[PDB]
Each structure stands twice: as C-alpha cells, then as structure tokens.
Design a protein around this ligand. Sequence first.
Ligand SMILES: Nc1ncnc2c1ncn2[C@@H]1O[C@H](COP(=O)(O)OP(=O)(O)O)[C@@H](O)[C@H]1O
Ligand SMILES: Nc1ncnc2c1ncn2[C@@H]1O[C@H](COP(=O)(O)OP(=O)(O)O)[C@@H](O)[C@H]1O
Ligand SMILES: [Ca+2]
Ligand SMILES: [Ca+2]
Ligand SMILES: [Ca+2]
Ligand SMILES: [Ca+2]
Lengths: 379, 379
Amino acid sequence: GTVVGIDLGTTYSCVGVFKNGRVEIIANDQGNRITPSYVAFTPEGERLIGDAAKNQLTSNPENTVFDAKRLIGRTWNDPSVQQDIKFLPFKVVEKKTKPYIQVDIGGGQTKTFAPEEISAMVLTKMKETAEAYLGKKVTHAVVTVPAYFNDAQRQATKDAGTIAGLNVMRIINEPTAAAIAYGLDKREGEKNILVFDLGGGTFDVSLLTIDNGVFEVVATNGDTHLGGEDFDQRVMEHFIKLYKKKTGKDVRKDNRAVQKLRREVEKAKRALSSQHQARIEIESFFEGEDFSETLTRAKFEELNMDLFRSTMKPVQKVLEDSDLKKSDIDEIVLVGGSTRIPKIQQLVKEFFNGKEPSRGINPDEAVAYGAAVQAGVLS
Amino acid sequence: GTVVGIDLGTTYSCVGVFKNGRVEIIANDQGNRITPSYVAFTPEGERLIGDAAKNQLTSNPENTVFDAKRLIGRTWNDPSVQQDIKFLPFKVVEKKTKPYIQVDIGGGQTKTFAPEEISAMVLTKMKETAEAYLGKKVTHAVVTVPAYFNDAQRQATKDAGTIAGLNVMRIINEPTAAAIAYGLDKREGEKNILVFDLGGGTFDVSLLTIDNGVFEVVATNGDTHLGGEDFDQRVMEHFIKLYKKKTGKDVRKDNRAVQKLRREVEKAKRALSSQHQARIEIESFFEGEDFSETLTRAKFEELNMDLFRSTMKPVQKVLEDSDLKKSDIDEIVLVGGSTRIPKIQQLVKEFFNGKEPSRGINPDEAVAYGAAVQAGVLS
Ligand SMILES: Nc1ncnc2c1ncn2[C@@H]1O[C@H](COP(=O)(O)OP(=O)(O)O)[C@@H](O)[C@H]1O
Ligand SMILES: Nc1ncnc2c1ncn2[C@@H]1O[C@H](COP(=O)(O)OP(=O)(O)O)[C@@H](O)[C@H]1O
Ligand SMILES: [Ca+2]
Ligand SMILES: [Ca+2]
Ligand SMILES: [Ca+2]
Ligand SMILES: [Ca+2]
C-alpha cells in the first residue's frame, strides 16, 4: 500500500516517501539521495543504472544513454528532437515517425529502445532504492513532469512507469510539486507563485496561482538548453586556454584529460556555492604533466555573468504573459541544484527588490518532496 | 687523487669508480647501488640524505626535499619553475630572481637553501659512499647533466660539487655517458645513436653522432614530466576505485593508506618487469580493513597503454629534427629504471622494425658507469 514520490529529472532523479507525518528522501545503495538519470550497456552485457552508468561514460560514450527526458513522448519531426540528436553521443534512429535509442548490449547484439524504455530503467532503480529502504514492494508512484509537457509526453512517462512495474497513479507538474513541498497549497486566499527551476541542462520559470488549495499554471518560460553544464563549460574553456598559456599543452584532443578536468570543475563549482575559493588539482593530467589552479567565486561569476543575467529575461516574460507586475508575486520558489549558486540567488532577490525566496527544503530534493506529499495523500 | 663518476639524477643518484681495469658501481651504507636524491630535516635537527630521507617523507612532507634538479640553475621567471613549485610539498620562495627551498631545520629555526645547496648534500652522500669503499678521501668527480642543460644549470651543478667539497673536473651529457658505458665512443666511422632515457619523473630522447670518438648532440626531445611515477599513478587510481567498489571505503582522505598503497604499487610494477603477476597485500590498510589484489602485466600495460605509446612521438621528432630516417639509426641505447618495462622495450624495437637495443649494462647504473669510465681517463 506504499505510494512513493519520484522526481524523474533530465540529469538526476530523486525518490521520497511520506512516513510518520514527514517526507523521507531515500538514499540509494551508494548513499546518494539523488541518482543520475543515466543507463549504460557494457560489452560484457551488464546493464548499469545511475552512478555506475555515469562513471563509465568516458570509456563507453556510444552506449551510455542520458537526457532521454529530452526525447520522451516526442515525434521525430519535433524541431527539439532534430536539434538534440546532433549533440547526443549515442545513436538516435527514426522508427514509425519516433526517435529510438540504438545501443550495443553486448554478445554482438544491437537493441533499439524507446525513450520511455530508458526512463523505465531509471524508474526501476528508484523503485529498487525505495524497496530496499522500506523492506517491502513498491508498485505505485506519483511522478513529476515539466508544466509544459503535452498529453503524449505525460502518457509516455506513465508508460515508463508501467514498463518498470510502477502504477503511476498521478502525473503532477514540477513547479506545483515545488509549491506543495513549501506548503503553499495550505496558504489561505489567492496567491501568485514564481517558481525558478535551474537544473543541470534546463531552466524553467513558472507563474502559478493558488486558490483555496487549487493550483493553476498561468505561464511558463525559460531556456530548454541552459543549466549547470553551461556554467561548467565556461570554466572548462577558461582553464583549457590557461593551461596552453602556462605549459604550452593543448588538452582538447585528449578525451581522458578533458573528462578529468570536467569532473574537478563540477566539484569546484559545487564548493564555490558555500566557499569563495576551490583548488583544482589533477596528478598526471596530460603527458605526465600535472594540473593545479585555484578558482575564486569572483572568477566563476565573471566567466558566467552574461548567462546568470540571462535567467532574468524569462522571469520578466512570465510576468508580462500573466499580466502581472513584480509587486504581484507573493512567493518566490528556487528549486534545482543550480539555484544553490549565490549570484543566482542575489540576481532573483535584486529583481524582486530584496524579497526573500522560500527556504527550508533542499533545492534538488524539493520536487521529489512535493511528489512524496501528494503520494502520501493517495496512500 | 681518485676521480669518481656521479649520476646526479632527478629521483636517484649513483657513484662509480674505474679500478683494476673495470667500472665498480659503489653500494651505499645500506648496500644499495643507487641512492634517492632526497634530503630531510627532522624536528630533532638531524639532516637525513638518501634512503633515510625518502623513508620518512609521509610523516614529514613539508621538510623533505626532492626534485632539486628541476630547479637548479633556473631563474624564478622560468615557466618550468612556475609550474613545478605548485606540485612540490616543501616551500619554494623567490630571493634575488631565483627559487630557494625554505624548510624547518629544528630548534624553532627556518633555513632557505639554493637548489645547488640541496644537490650539494646529495653529492656529499655519494662522496662518503665512495670514500667508505675506497678507504681514502675523494675530492675529484665527473658529474652528468641532461644534454639540454644551459650554462647556468651546468655551473650550478659545479657549484653543488664545490659546496660538497668536490672539484667537478668535467660536466658530461647523460646520453653521452650512456653511449660511453656501451663503448660506442671506441667505434670507427660516423654512427647515429638514439638514446632513450626514461626515469622516475622525466623522459629524455637524444640523437648523438659519434665520429671516431668525437660526440655531437644533434637533437634532443622527450617529456620533462613523464616517468615511472606516472605509471604508478595510473595503477593507484585503478586500485583506489576498485577498493571503493569492493569494500565501500574511500582511501583518498587517508594519506597513511595512500602512502602504503603507493609503496606496494611501486614494488608490484618493478616485479612485473620480470614476472606476469604481482600480489599487492596490505594488513590493516584502512579502518582495520585489509587490502589484497593481484596486478597482472596485462592490466599494468592496459592502464598505461596511452603513456607507453606517447614515448614514440619524441623519438619520431628527434629523427625529423636530425633529418634522419629510422634505417639511419646504428645503435639504440635504453637507460633509466623505467626502460626495464618489457612493453617499452617492445614498442621501441617494433618502431625500429625489430632492431635490438644495446644490452649488457644495468640501465639503472649506465649513466654513472659512463661517468666512471671518463673519470678513469682523467685519473
Ligand atoms: N552546490 C551546488 N552549486 C552549484 N551547482 C550545483 C550545486 N549542487 C548541484 N548543482 C548543479 O545542479 C545541477 C543538477 O540539478 P538537479 O535539479 O539536481 O538536476 P536536473 O538537471 O535533473 O534537474 C548540476 O548542474 C549540478 O552541478
Ligand atoms: N624493474 C623495474 N621495472 C619498472 N620500473 C622500474 C624498475 N626498476 C626501476 N624502475 C623505475 O625507474 C625509475 C627510476 O629511474 P632512475 O633512472 O633510477 O632514476 P631518475 O628518476 O633519477 O632518472 C622509478 O620510477 C622506478 O620505479
Ligand atoms: Ca547547454
Ligand atoms: Ca609526471
Ligand atoms: Ca531538477
Ligand atoms: Ca636516471
């Protein structure tokens, strides 16, 4: 009789359960409370899901699948699909006017998967994560989707559940889930909520109205290809140029070196949300040469200042599309791992003339938290 | 007086003497025919040189000095110095546009040493090693330097001798010393010699012409930061990841654990030059947990395949810069401890279409051997 809440995110997924009047965000077998939305197929024929899949991307780039959420429930002709497939390192082929993911599954075998079949494997891992913690079977979930997801995208997400042996009882909007997490449904009267959702690869801004516990998505905007990955990319460019200046070595050719730098840049960025300097040190980086540079928050902000500023444009556009002033916003909800960046928090607060956002919930767990609350009601 | 030949190497040094019509490589107080180019200052005010210095590095990282050869006779502004100081665990400070090593010498006192003062202490140890075996004082030496060393680096090496109470009668090029050890100086006609020198931290390739006993260094190349250290690091990374997978323990945090693994990895690598498997076993490795893994030559080669292949590029480059073809190479000389690796010997031989290298001289001792022959002539 257990119903879990699942954030099926673009780069990470999160599972929670309402138990003893509180939401418990469930840590996976590695002790991580979020799991990469990654699936890998080894030459030996082993299926890897989550951390294991992400950690062997560099050695297995063609048969490591991610960003299936970009393709799920879309037609081949969708301009979004035509753009995305050019940048995914695994083969995407057209069958029956739909994108399919073609991978080597080992034993000289190729297999073509629908995007919802890949998402099904991610949901299987989140289901197994919940089962291990509770010590019983989990066959029911509330799953979250972007507010702008159409009927076909919502149905494909339910289908992912069915393939994974989950009854997806309700599909709920990500910004609504975030609002529920902060108990903004339990607010009395009519309130305008601005949800600012910045993840690994996507930026979503949503204007919600709440009226006596009923939510309405009034307007949505953002950038489908702006997230934390882009902030990493700006730092990567900087240090690749700086390394060539200092040592004379060009590392762009060496995938191993670039991969090692990307890992340490990601780590450095995360640290710079809670401290002002982060040391990037890599032993035997390139031709036996070592890498050592300190990234300051100032430098990180400088390298990304235009990208950070650009997040305000979709906020102004949802206010315009909603026929609202910045004074009409009653609640600001910042969710997604990238909203941890102090400069992002500063720019949003400055935009709303010093108005503090909602706080108390882990921003990369907030969507799953909301799903878990709704899952609790259905349980 | 008796003139000794000294290989003053980056990581190891070696002293030889010509006596009874043969070179004798002199074993130190511990019975080792090579001595670590290491100096350590204890809190008690004791100055340790060689084996003793290297053995207490883990407990005394800030006041254990090594790789002085990377700094000797260089200016502060030298791009080489600016890179290297970032990866040395002891303090390097600028005085009078030059690098100086600052260390705690005990009794609440700090002392700044020029690189040549640290090398002087290494030469003092090699001097005492020779004096003990000979039973008389040694005040004359021939010392080897890399072929690419400039006037300042050569003069600073002579200065290191003077500080140690040695008259450095001649500074000879390391690849020339290697060639002299194999008696290639006593060949009639104009021969082209490829010297492939792979040590603990450095890779040097030299094209020498020998014309009836007169040497010319025609071209030099290699990788200033590629050596045996890097091959260890590739194995270290593998086993740190494997241990985490099998036990759930992350050992990067514990310097004690990492130090123990590095020691056994170094021993395992050495064994894999003469056998196909090496057992790495550490009792109470991490929080009382033990470590047991077998390293095969195959796995060692796989982890380092790109680094090993990379050593062929500088060989092709010296041929190009010398306006010579592979077929023009008359002698191949492999020196340095890392040339013991079978895969390295295979790649060089395959590069030169099955041409066997010079053999008979211990590759660890070949440079010191050559220095000793030249020292024997000046005697
Ligand atoms: N402390 C932090 N500082 C900066 N960025 C962070 C921090 N923690 C996580 N992130 C970023 O959050 C992004 C992931 O967002 P998340 O909401 O977890 O995933 P998704 O992309 O699936 O929405 C990544 O780009 C990651 O680098
Ligand atoms: N049998 C062996 N197999 C592989 N590497 C070896 C072997 N013996 C020594 N080495 C390596 O040789 C390196 C030392 O090279 P050497 O020429 O003695 O010193 P230096 O670094 O001063 O040139 C170390 O990295 C050591 O691990
Ligand atoms: Ca992007
Ligand atoms: Ca190195
Ligand atoms: Ca997210
Ligand atoms: Ca050497």
